Structure 1
Amino acid sequence: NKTVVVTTILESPYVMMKKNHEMLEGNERYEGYCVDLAAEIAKHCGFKYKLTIVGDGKYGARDADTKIWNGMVGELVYGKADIAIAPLTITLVREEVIDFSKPFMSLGISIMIKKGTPIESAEDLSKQTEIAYGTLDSGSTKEFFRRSKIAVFDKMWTYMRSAEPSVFVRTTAEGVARVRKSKGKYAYLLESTMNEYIEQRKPCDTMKVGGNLDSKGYGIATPKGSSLRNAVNLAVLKLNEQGLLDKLKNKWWYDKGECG
């Protein structure tokens, strides 16, 4: 009976360093939605666990040439971690190599603008050129655009892939900062969950505009053949039914919201 290695990612408000982390040990160093969720998954499934921050800071993409998976998906695939409890999007390319639980949170790709940017939709972005637009450089949002068979998203991808300087960002923080600094001339494509979060953070200068471009979810991911698979999945279901997932989202998004 071993300590389960949990891979996760420093992404607010899912996992954050506590103020006093240097004075704390192990799992107590971290706080956030996924920290709370990991404690509950572990309790319901009856395992001890160790939170680990993904080494490369990435979510998980497979390199076209080397076929190597990076990020948290890589850590699962290569057996460096036993479970990923993180804002990790359920995707087909990932579900082909790892198992996901039923989604614990819903999201879709969305548009973040600096307040007062004349953009209402993904159509509005594709039709103009004054406002630059991009995504996280190594995640499911980028892959949505790259793998699309849909005309308008193919159009947006074609712009983004060739845009100079690069419209892609290394971290959500960088995307958000870029929106805040580009005086309305950069829009960021990111998941609605992160968009919603940032809209409630000081200095309250960004907002989600328009509908989501897709509808999907984050799931808890395990390597194929994990003994944790069934129990993790039932735990997610139990926690949803008991209202905990809604409670945790409110706790980390809205209850401490800085924008009124």
Structure 2
Amino acid sequence: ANKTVVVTTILESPYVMMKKNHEMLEGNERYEGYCVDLAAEIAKHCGFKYKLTIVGDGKYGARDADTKIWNGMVGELVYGKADIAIAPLTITLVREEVIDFSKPFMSLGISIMIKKGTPIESAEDLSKQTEIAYGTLDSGSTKEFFRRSKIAVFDKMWTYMRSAEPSVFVRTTAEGVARVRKSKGKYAYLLESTMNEYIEQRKPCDTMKVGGNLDSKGYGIATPKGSSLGNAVNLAVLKLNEQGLLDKLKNKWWYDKGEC
């Protein structure tokens, strides 16, 4: 429909999740989460109607070295399939070069998730040993962070990870978490702190974040390069942050019921 903004997003708790009973629901009402609420807020402030669509290949966005084709939500923006991406999408240099980003709406860093009791306290710890395997999501800013790093500990970790057998890489966050939970403390998962903290507060309460974050960065709302929508969306993010509304949303979707 004319004037309808196509929003690309991704299923990632608690950002975007299928509602209970979603099978009888339709359109935007199928989904719930932090980014679903944020999308509604941004839309309201900028005065547009929008349609949420889950990205086809289920990926965030990387560029194939061979074909130099972008995939994921980044791909959707770059090739004109979506008008805006509203998701836990990390602002990185290589992405900033091909799409526009708002100022960040949330902060985060790469962190370590272990099964409770695992004798690891830091990235350094992981790097100095081999009994406990560790990996990341097979595509995204986290894996790219280790692949590009010239920092000693991270470089070591990467040279280990890219070769380890069987693969320490997983296809989804849920899959990474599952692997931590099944491996009796022999697998540690490298993921962004926001997801780590969410999962930490959920049953069966057998995982935990250890150490400080390995880096500091932010999620931004992304639009195609030079899109006129960019300006309004950026001012809207800043406005919502200043009203304390971004904080309210974090507190709502990371609200601790006491499962753990």
- With the shorter chain as reference, the TM-score category is over 0.9
Gapped regions of structure 1 (runs ≥ 5): none
State the Cα distance separating 1:256 from its structure 2 match: 4.4
Relative distance call for 1:235 and 1:256 in structure 2 (3 A) is: farther
**Cα pair 2:91 2:219 within 8 Å, conserved:** yes
Q: Equivalents in 1 of 2:258, 2:11: separation in Å?
A: 19
Relative distance call for 1:256 and 1:34 in structure 2 (3 A) is: farther
TM value normalised by structure 2: 0.98
Q: Equivalents in 2 of 1:71, 1:158: separation in Å?
A: 26
Secondary structure of 2:23's counterpart equals helix
Q: Equivalents in 2 of 1:51, 1:227: separation in Å?
A: 19
What does 1:186-201 align with in structure 2 at a 5 Å threshold? 186-201=187-202
State the Cα distance separating 1:23 from its structure 2 match: 1.4
**Cα pair 2:103 2:234 within 8 Å, conserved:** yes
TM value normalised by structure 1: 0.98
Gapped regions of structure 2 (runs ≥ 5): none
Alignment match, 1:133 = 134
State the Cα distance separating 1:106 from its structure 2 match: 0.5
Q: Equivalents in 1 of 2:241, 2:176: separation in Å?
A: 31
Secondary structure of 1:187's counterpart equals strand
Q: Residue deviations 1:77-105, cap 9 Å, x none?
A: 01110000000000000000011101111
State the Cα distance separating 1:258 from its structure 2 match: 2.6
State the Cα distance separating 1:255 from its structure 2 match: 4.4
How many residues align? The count is 259
Q: Residue deviations 1:104-158, cap 9 Å, x none?
A: 1110000000010000000000001000000000100000000112111111000
Secondary structure of 2:162's counterpart equals helix
What fraction of aligned residue pairs are identical, expressed as a percent?
100
Q: Equivalents in 2 of 1:170, 1:64: separation in Å?
A: 19
Moved more, 15-24 or 84-93: 15-24
Q: Residue deviations 1:174-226, cap 9 Å, x none?
A: 00000000000000000000000100110000010001000001000000011
Q: Equivalents in 2 of 1:251, 1:209: separation in Å?
A: 24
**Cα pair 2:114 2:185 within 8 Å, conserved:** yes
Moved more, 27-36 or 246-255: 246-255
Q: Equivalents in 2 of 1:75, 1:149: separation in Å?
A: 31
State the Cα distance separating 1:257 from its structure 2 match: 5.5
**Cα pair 2:201 2:256 within 8 Å, conserved:** no
Q: Equivalents in 2 of 1:153, 1:144: separation in Å?
A: 9
State the Cα distance separating 1:22 from its structure 2 match: 1.6
Relative distance call for 1:116 and 1:98 in structure 2 (3 A) is: same
Q: Equivalents in 2 of 1:256, 1:60: separation in Å?
A: 33
Q: Equivalents in 2 of 1:66, 1:249: separation in Å?
A: 38
Relative distance call for 1:187 and 1:218 in structure 2 (3 A) is: same
Secondary structure of 2:223's counterpart equals strand
Q: Equivalents in 1 of 2:229, 2:201: separation in Å?
A: 35
State the Cα distance separating 1:25 from its structure 2 match: 1.3
Secondary structure of 2:58's counterpart equals coil
State the Cα distance separating 1:254 from its structure 2 match: 2.0
Q: Equivalents in 2 of 1:237, 1:258: separation in Å?
A: 33
